[PDB]
Structures are given as structure tokens and as C-alpha cells.
Symmetry: D2
Subunit: 367 residues, 4 copies
């Protein structure tokens, strides 16, 4: 594994990658050393969200223009866009790049490492079933090794992008005598993320191998580091593993915890603590002093329709889906911790953290 | 002035007032002494929000059934319903009732006092112009006297409910050859709140009497205690003035501060401090120990489209209006402070606190 | 019993004044009102509370102006289909019985109405055989109440059944029961679908289906079922409408099918079957006041196309296809009738063929 | 004037231009002879609709790839994307290309002619004011001359694409000490179309030059052929003038009429008649027999909130804006006439036909 440089840049428009271009010009990182991008785009966050492909193309063109890598090489860089920036959430991209050896001093302290992998092809009949779980788990171990990590406890954040079900793939499944878990395009999104999350939890040894009946139903089964996204651009699981390794060097370190509910700011502080920042007992955003790069977390409205004993009407709201409602709410909860509205807040959290909450990972600048 | 009993009760459904009925049966307060209700309803929060009148009638029926007051006496109790409970916000009602002097300890420490008034009828052509401002100012001054307050500095929170513009009233406006400030019903909600806020600010002597040119344009002109809501429940300004008075007694006290932006949790803590709660200097929701009755605050998306230097896309979002996005966001920010999703968070804050923020008032149980 | 049918506008969410005016003008008697079917201007989904507001305004007129007790009025089936996207005008169709001394009873087929309330439908019943069997029994009850023995004489069955809410899902699980789904919005389609199969069983259009058929076997459907769901009553509100000879009256009902959202000919066919003699290519101006209302279902097809052209309704996370296709068919329908007050209802599982729905028409013949 | 070839092709996805590529390969038309595109995209149709630029880029790249025209020449081809395909409306593009004289039959019958222009740059302070009106009028006169039309009566359809107001452009306006007609981005859509429509009406001599106070208020002033759309694709007015000329030849002819209200199917049939299709009285979609290329029309919710005496609640609906409601409704009304869900139905028709309705143009294949 290599030492990693991590930069979070704003998007000034749906098609803006100029801040990545500026980092390259200022020599903060090298175009060809960019190995992964994880960001938030200002689309609706649902099925018909096309701000993800716009941002995807704007960034790959900067990488192709400013580096010696060929456009075919750039296309292999995993870029994950979580649509939907309700409320104060600021569209942004977190850039992961390798550092040249002559810029790193390797320490025995744990420092940030990144691994990437692509699973075997996921067919429409795999989605949400043990076939998806097993294929994802193998890819997660692959990306884990690529990061130079052997201990699952050193994995703090796993970001994925998996296929959805469409009319075309559903027809494809049935034209070979296969079945699909569901035919609702919106619901397959939660299904794809859920099955992928269980895969992550298996590879990392957080749970025992579950059954087909567990997916979307056994919500006590979950991963504490899984952040799963789905879409249509790819028929494979794209895996990005972010963790720590000793003896690699670098300035950044990752840690994680869990949010037990949408208001659990202490869970976020716990992730920042676990990432290696020493903070006061009751910390405030002003205590961070520039040292928080970003946080990455999931959230969801709980099955019981309550938070801390108080009823809300999210699950009954046919006007604005609870996906967008809870995203905005936790966006404010999270940005109030970090002091920076540029936060990675993502919805659809089946088997991703405890029911009604989600995992939270934090990357900090330690030097 | 009279001692006030303040209770915050949940709404278990759109038409539920059972928790108010139970307070009356348990002798916590008397039906005939309820002088104002301020609550959050689970409607959409815009023009076609009819959960406001459903809750309005369900509560007025408990007051009429369980008290000796006539139904037209009850109809003059100002009941303000702020629709829209996006995110975790829990539908609830804050009930204000008078206590007989024989039951409160008349410390000369400042304790809660409440004043009520109804403006003249506000016609659709009045909305957003000097006619609305002058009518509201008169009602605010009357409600201030009704609270037994002479010094405007003792007013911490002015909650209003004013008519907005609908097709019907716009049609009514034109049926007399009269004009309306705007015919976009959704934006007339911001207009009605703004004109009412300026009314409050003049009555309290925070600003000089403004002109028609200033409404919605001179955003440096604002009140520091105005919380203005608009709706379809009544064609007059329902005024509730809440402040403190010495020598009145009671167990509750109000204070206020300002939120500089949607993430300004410290502004909320400042209001709770100003209300008279001793708190640690890095406070947490667990420090409140049941002593926070509720907080009442306004919020809005800033005109420059940024929070703390970070761009957001609220003002360009044609899918989910920024009213609902920022409400959900600030609901989470606020509920994380109080630890109680039952918070009064209201949107559209023209001339209500500084641009991009709003006032925040807090009522605490001191004993 | 001869039936009087009146369609009245709602001037606001809580307005029942036009029903009060019909009673005052002697057009019909409060206690003879036996069913109401209407459109309310709510969102048409789960959190639509304009249905109970209109429910309250109308029931208060009925018992205020009649000798019926508020407990009897509560037994009058009132069906509110929320969502009036586009030009659709909020309205109520009132069905009342006529006193014998005002009726000229003819052997020509004339309108008859039957009503029933099913057994209690619990959240675990929704979408399963328990819902199907309880609805079927109530439909047969309402059918007998209409004085109809032949199912072919039934042209229109309008229902209102509970959907699933967070409250009812909680109650189901607080008794150790399961629910077909926990997505409240999609439980609307489930409740309509299970109720439609119930209607289809009672009328002998299909054999009794299985739990696995609900929402999946879309070749199974009723040709007269119009099923709506909401949060107004925890039972199936049944209204059976058909024709009977020798009863008298001046209204007659007929029906046909809309094969897709644009099938205006299907609507004209229903008006024809109701007994209006119309030109080959009819226009709204040909109706000459004789169309009381039409009642129809619509839905977005699973294959995402209408007449070979793809649309993006099923992928739209911003505005649900329920509201999109309702507005679209509202325009298609109002263009036929010339009257934006049309009963257009969305979510048509097992209600007509896939991608379409039934359409019933009531006409004034004299 | 050149003879025109008109083809309507479906969009199989947001970024699909393959059907245009197929027309070029099959020799139906020449890449470099494509002079205008008018289409419907499956975005939300409001401010944050980015399916317009996605389709814009996909089409210009086919034009640049398959022709000898330079990319900056292609950029001057007016391509108008009307977002929002609510209901059955099918995403599609109508392609207008010139035909070499040697491929058409010279007839003295009126046949289709097309003219194009780009206006002077329109800044955010221009939108909705006399500056926009005068700039658009000049461009329309240029596009009319480019079509070889001298008599305004020969113009049947003027399609435009103009900038609307966003936070960015509003911030740009204020960063130079300028004002904007409004700061409600969603409302500026109606403003941009309205000001452009008055421009068209001036150039065509349908009205006298209006004042700033007339825009959005004097709805008796309107053009009978203007179809104005706004978005974020270009900061200038893209003008397409479509009419008929004698002695030019070609297969296609255009005509127009007016829709008085959303249900006025006869208005649509009248346009098809005027375009030169001999159809039966009481026509049906089955009478068209493949000869209707497309229809292009405007629609809007009337100011008085009624259609044919019946109240609707479109204008009070804060959940789904009346733009999307009436678009879906008229989409069904229109597609039922044509039998083809691929129809150009456009919303927001200020000064475009009479209030509550809009113009409707039809292009037919006559041979
Ligand atoms: N990719 C997903 O599963 C859910 N995504 C959907 C999207 O990005 O449009 C929303 C999110 O990540 O918060
Ligand atoms: N008319 C407009 O300005 C916007 N358009 C949609 C768009 O292109 O943004 C609405 C329509 O054409 O129906
Ligand atoms: Cl190296
Ligand atoms: Cl350590
Ligand atoms: Cl009798
Ligand atoms: Cl051909
Ligand atoms: Na979770
Ligand atoms: Na403010
Ligand atoms: Na159907
Ligand atoms: Na118009």
C-alpha cells in the first residue's frame, strides 16, 4: 500500500471539477495518482438523478486532460457519487491520491490507506440474495488486501456502488427462467445496498453468513462501516475500502463509530475521536481547528416512526419522501458537528448500522 | 398580569387533543384558563395545509366541551399551528394557561407572562403593505398591555398567525378592483410573515415605521423576537406576546437569542441560558434534565445560497421547496440541542432576525 | 327503490353547502341519501386528510338536516378519492332514494344502488385472502341490497378500504402479526388490489385466487371494480351500482374499459352502454347535459410505455406516477365529458387490464 | 429559403442521441444540414433540470462527430430542450435539416421553411424587462429573414430558449449593483418566457412595444405563435422561426391555431387542419395515418383557478407545482388527439396565447 493524500473540494456547479484542477496545478496531488473519488451531488437522490453522471464526466475529463493516463485508464478509477444534498449539504468531492515516496516519512503510527476492487458480475437474480452477498464479500477482501490491511478492525469505511434492477435486466432475468427479488425500481435500491452491506459485514467478520430471508428483514444484522450506493452505470460491485495501516506514513487517519439515531451527534464525535483526534468531553466544531477532512455516514427513518420516544410522520409522507426528509435533517445534525456543510450524508441504510441510524466514519489530518 | 402554566403535549394523530383533555382532568390546568396554544402540525406547511384547521377544531372542542366558555369565546383564543414537521420534528402543542394567584410563589424574579390580541381583519390587499404593518402593530401593542408589559425589552417572543394569499382571496381581492402584492400563493406565505414581522418590530420600537418599498427587500430591517406564521385558519392576525414580569410568580421563564445561520446551535443554547437555566459552558442535551419546555425559532435559506462559505442548492430546487428542506435541517439541529424532537421550528423568516437566520426563544421550568 | 343522482361541487375542503342546498330545494331528502362518492383536493396518498374533512362536513349535514341519528349516518358509505391533479374539480356524487309518489316506474333498465360494510379489516388482512373473502361477502351483501341477482347487471363497484400506516403496522406487530409490506404508499396499491380481487370473486369474474396472486397475477381482474384506499374507515365501504327493470327513475348506468390512459373511446363506450345514443365520433357538446359523471381507474403500465412510446413515470422520485397519470387521465377524461368534475382514481391493480382500468358512466335519460 | 426535412425521434435514455445518428447513417438527412432541434427531456422541467444539458451535449456531439462542422459552429445550432415529460409524454427530439434542392419536388404549394438566430447576450437584469423584449425582437426578425419570410402572417411557430434566474446569476446581477425582477428562481421561468413572448409579438407586429409594467400583468397582450421556454442551457435567446413558403418544395407543412383552455382538443385539430391535412369533421387519431410529425403547444393554469366553470386547486398546491400538474394533464389531452405520446407540450405561457390557454402548432407530412 501507499501513503494517501485526501482532499475535499467543493463543486461550484453540477459540472464543476475546477477545484480538482487547481489541486493538480498547485502540486497538492498528481492527476495520475488519483485512485478514488467519493462525493455528493445536488440531484434528487432517487432513481432519476442524473447529476451523478454529469459530475462523473467532469472529473474524469480533468484526470484525462491533466495526466498521462489514457481515457481508458481514467475510466477504471472508482468514482462514487451519492446524490441528494437537501438543506445545507454542500456538493463536494473527496479525492484520494497516492503520495510519491520522496514526500512521505513512514511512521509506525496507523495512517490512512485505500484499497479498491471490482466484484464478479452481479446478475439481476443475484441482487439481494446470497449470491450478491458472497460475491461482494470476496471483492471486499480483495480491496482490503489492496489497502494492505489484514485485520478487519483496521477497516473503518467501505463505500460501494452496485447495480439496480431495471425493466431491461428484470426481463433479462426472466428470459433465462430466473426470478427477481422485486420489480419496483425504487425498492431495488434499498435491496441492492442492503445485500451489499451484508456482504461487507461477512467479509469483515461482523456477522455470520446470513440467509436469503434475512435480507431487508433481519435489521439487527448490520455492518458498522458499510456505506452502500446503487445505480445503473455498472453491472458489478465497485468497492472502496478505507482504513489504516502501520508503517505506511502519510498525514491522514480514519476512524469510525455508529449513529444510533438521527440526533446522535455523540456518535459522530466518537468517530472523530476514533480517527485519532483528542477532543474535549463535550466537543464543539471550533475544537477541530481545520483537522477534520470529512465525515461519511448513513441515516434512515426507523421502522417504528419515532425518535427518542417522539412520533414523526416521515413514513406516512407521500409528498416528500422520508429519504429526502431524513437526509436534510441529519445533514444539519452532521454539519453542526463539523462546522462544514460539506458532509457525506447518505440515505438507504438497510443493514448499514443499527436500525434508525447508520455508520459514521471520519478522516482527520494528523500530520 | 397573571401567572402562567405552560405544558407541551404530543399530538398522537392529526385530530388528537386527548393530551390536553388529560391535563384538564388531572387538574394540571383549567379549560377556561387556557389563553393561547402554539403547536406544530404534520401537514405540508404550505398553502394547502389542512392539518392546521383539523388540530384547531379538535382543540377548540376540548376547550368548549370541558369548560364553561361559549364556543365563540373559545373561537377567540389565539391558536397558532405551524404546519410542516419535516424530519424528526414531532407534532405537539404548547398550551398556555393562567394560574390563580393562590397557587404560585410570587418571587420578584422574572417569571412568565402572556398577552393575547386579535388584529382587525386583514384583507388580501393588505398583505405585505403598510396597512398590514399598522394593523399588526396595534394588535401587538394591545397584546403587550394584556401581558402587563410596559417595557419592550421584556418581550422575548411574539408569535403570530396571519392570512396568506389563495386563489379565493386573490379572486376576492379582484372582485373589488383591488390589487395584491403577489399572486404566487406559496410566496405570499413569506410576504405575510414579513409584513407581520415589521409590524411587530415597529410596535416594539425596534425599527422606525417602514415603507412599502422595504417589505421583502430591506432585510436589515427585522425584529429580534418575531416568530410569524401564515396560513388558512383565520383572516386576522392572531397575536401571542410572551415575556417576563417581576412579582407575578409561576415556575416558568422565557428568554431569547438569535440563530445566525441554520447550524448555529450556540444561539439556541444562548436562548436557554437567557431564559434562566444554569448550564455548563459546553452544554449537552443531557444537562437539561426535563427543565426545557420548548424552544421556538425561525429559519430560512440565505439569499446568497451559502452557509458558512459552502454552496447549497436549496433556492434552485424545484422538486422539494427550500421551505421544507431547511425546516427538516434546522429541526435536526434544534432537536439535537434539546434532545426532544418536539421543537417549534418555523420557516420563512423575512424581517425575523438577520438574513439567513432567525430568532430563537426558550421557555424553561425553574420552579 | 328509484335512485336520484346529483353531482355537486365542493367550493372548499370543508364545503357541503351544495348538498344542503339540494335538501332545502327539495331535490332530495337527507334521510334518503344512501351513498356518496367524491373527489377531494388532498394529495391522494397516505397523509391525505382532506378525505376526513369532507367526510365530516357531509355527515354533519345529513344528520343535522334529517331525523337519522349520527350513529345511523355513520353507516352511510362515503368514498372520498383524494387527489385532483390538473383540471379535476373537487365534487361529490350523491345517491338518494326517491319516494314512490315521485317515480314513474318503467320496464326500461334504470339505476339501482346497494351498500354494505365489510367485517373489520386488520392491517394483517390487507392484500391477503382474508381481505379478499371479507370484501367478497360484503359485495354480495351490497349486491342483494341493490336488488340484483345477476352479476352482469352490476356495472360499477366503488370501495373504500384501509391502507397501511405506521400506526396500523405498529398495531399489527404489537399483536405478533406480519404485514404484506411496510411501505405505506405502496400499501395503497395493495389495498385496492386485494379489494378488487374480492369484487371479482363475489361477481364470479374469477375463481378464488391465492395470496401469491395479489399484485402479481394481473391477468386476474374485475371489469367493474373501482377500489380506493385511505385512512377514513377500518372496514370496506362498498357501493354497488347497477340497473334493474321495473324500478323507475331517470338515471341509468353502463360501463366499458379503458385499455390505456389515452383510450377516450373506452369512455365513450361506457356512455353508450349507459344508454345514450351518440354519434360515431362523439364530442362533449353531444352530451347536452345528460352525463351525470364518469367513474374510472388508471395506472402506469409495468413496461413503461403507452402505445409504443416510453415515458419515465415509474422512475420519477420527484412526483410519484400516481399523481402524474391521474392528472394526465383527468385531462383525457374531462375532454370527453366537457366537465372537469370527473371521478378519476389511480392505482388499478386487478381493476381492468394492465395499464388501463374500468370506466362507468351514469346518464340522465328521463 | 431551403426545403426542410423534419424527423421526430425518441430518446431511449437521458443521454441518447442514437436515433439522430441512425438518420445520418441511413442518409435521411445530413449532419451539417441540421439547423435546429426542438425536444422534450425527462427532467423535472424547473430550474434544477440538468437533463436539458445532458441531451444538449449528446446531440451536439453526434453533429460534431458525423459532420465537417466545427464544434464552435455546432454550438450555434439552436437546440431547445423543454424539460418535464409528466404522465405519458415521451422524451423525443424533432430534428430540422435542410434538403438539397435536387432531392425535393418544387411545388408552388406552401411548404416548410425554418429560420434560426441567436439574440444578443441576456444578463440576469435583462430578464422580464424591455431590454429582453428588444433583444428578442431583433433576433426574431433575423430568424424570420433567415427563413426567407417577409410577411409575419407566414410565421406559424416561434420556439425560443432563454435564460432564467438562478442563485448564481442573481448573485452575478447583484455583484454589479444591478437588480432582478424577482429572486424566486422558479417564478423567473414564467418571467423569462413572458418577456420573450412579448419580444416575439413585437417583432411580428402583433402588439405595440409594451412597458416594464406590462410584463406578467397585461395578459391581454400576447403572441399567437410564440412558444417560449427557459432553462440554464445558454445565456442568450435561441430563436427558431417556423413557417411556410411557396415555391420551396419539401414534404412538410406547418399550421397553427390556439388552445383556449387545457381541454380544448378542437384547437389542436384546428392546427392540424391549418397545417394542410384534409381530415374528417369529428376527427379521430386513427385518421392521421402517420402524417402528423408532431404538435407544439403551450399551456398554463388560469389566473381565476377554474376550467369551464369548475374550480381546481392547482394554484394552491404546494406539494406538486401547477407547472407539472397542468403539463401532465395537457399531455394526456394532446396525446389523445395525436395518438402519439411523443408530443411537444410546454408549460408557462405568459403572453403566449390567451390567458389559461396557449398556441398550438402542427407539422404534417403531405408528400
Ligand atoms: N445510491 C443509493 O443507493 C442512494 N442514493 C441515490 C442517489 O445517489 O441518487 C442516495 C444517497 O446515496 O444518499
Ligand atoms: N417553459 C419553460 O421555461 C421550462 N420548460 C421546461 C424546461 O425546459 O426547463 C417547461 C415547459 O416547457 O413545459
Ligand atoms: Cl514513488
Ligand atoms: Cl493506536
Ligand atoms: Cl316512500
Ligand atoms: Cl419515410
Ligand atoms: Na440503518
Ligand atoms: Na431571517
Ligand atoms: Na388495471
Ligand atoms: Na397564455
Amino acid at each position: 500500500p501507499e501513503a494517501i493524500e485526501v482532499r475535499k473540494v467543493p463543486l461550484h456547479s453540477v459540472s464543476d471539477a475546477s477545484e480538482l484542477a487547481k489541486l493538480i496545478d498547485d502540486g497538492v496531488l498528481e492527476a495520475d495518482r488519483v485512485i478514488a473519488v467519493i462525493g455528493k451531488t445536488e440531484g434528487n437522490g432517487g432513481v432519476n438523478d442524473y447529476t451523478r453522471i454529469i459530475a462523473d464526466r467532469a472529473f474524469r475529463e480533468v484526470l484525462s486532460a491533466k495526466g498521462n493516463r489514457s481515457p481508458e485508464e481514467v475510466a477504471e478509477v472508482p468514482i462514487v457519487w451519492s446524490g441528494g444534498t437537501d438543506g445545507v449539504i454542500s456538493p463536494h468531492a473527496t479525492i484520494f491520491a497516492t503520495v510519491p515516496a520522496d514526500k512521505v516519512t513512514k511512521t509506525d503510527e496507523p495512517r490512512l490507506t485505500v484499497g479498491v476492487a471490482m466484484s464478479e458480475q452481479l446478475l439481476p437474480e443475484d441482487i439481494g440474495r446470497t449470491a450478491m452477498i458472497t460475491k461482494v464479500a470476496a471483492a471486499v477482501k480483495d480491496a482490503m488486501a489492496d489497502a494492505g490491511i489484514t485485520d478487519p478492525a483496521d477497516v473503518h469505511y467501505v463505500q460501494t456502488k452496485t447495480p439496480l434492477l431495471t425493466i431491461h435486466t428484470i426481463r433479462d432475468a426472466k428470459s433465462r427462467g430466473k426470478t427477481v427479488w422485486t420489480e419496483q425500481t425504487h425498492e431495488s435500491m434499498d435491496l441492492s445496498n442492503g445485500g451489499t452491506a451484508l456482504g461487507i459485514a461477512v467479509a469483515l467478520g461482523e456477522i455470520d453468513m446470513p440467509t436469503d430471508e434475512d435480507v431487508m428483514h433481519s435489521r439487527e444484522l448490520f455492518s458498522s462501516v458499510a456505506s452502500c450506493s446503487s445505480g445503473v452505470e455498472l453491472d458489478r460491485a465497485q468497492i472502496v475500502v478505507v482504513g489504516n495501516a502501520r508503517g505506511v506514513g502519510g498525514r491522514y487517519r480514519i476512524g469510525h463509530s455508529v449513529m444510533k439515531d438521527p440526533l446522535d451527534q455523540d456518535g459522530i464525535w466518537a468517530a472523530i475521536r476514533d480517527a485519532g483526534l483528542e477532543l474535549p468531553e463535550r466537543p464543539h466544531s471550533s475544537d477541530l481547528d481545520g483537522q477534520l477532512v470529512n465525515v461519511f455516514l448513513k441515516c434512515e427513518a426507523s421502522q417504528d416512526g419515532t425518535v427518542r420516544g417522539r412520533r414523526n410522520a416521515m413514513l406516512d409522507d407521500s409528498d416528500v419522501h422520508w429519504h429526502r426528509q431524513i437526509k436534510s435533517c441529519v445533514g444539519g445534525v452532521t454539519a453542526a458537528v463539523t462546522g462544514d456543510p460539506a458532509v457525506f450524508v447518505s440515505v438507504s441504510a438497510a443493514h448499514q448500522g443499527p436500525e434508525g441510524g447508520g455508520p459514521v466514519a471520519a478522516i482527520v489530518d494528523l500530520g
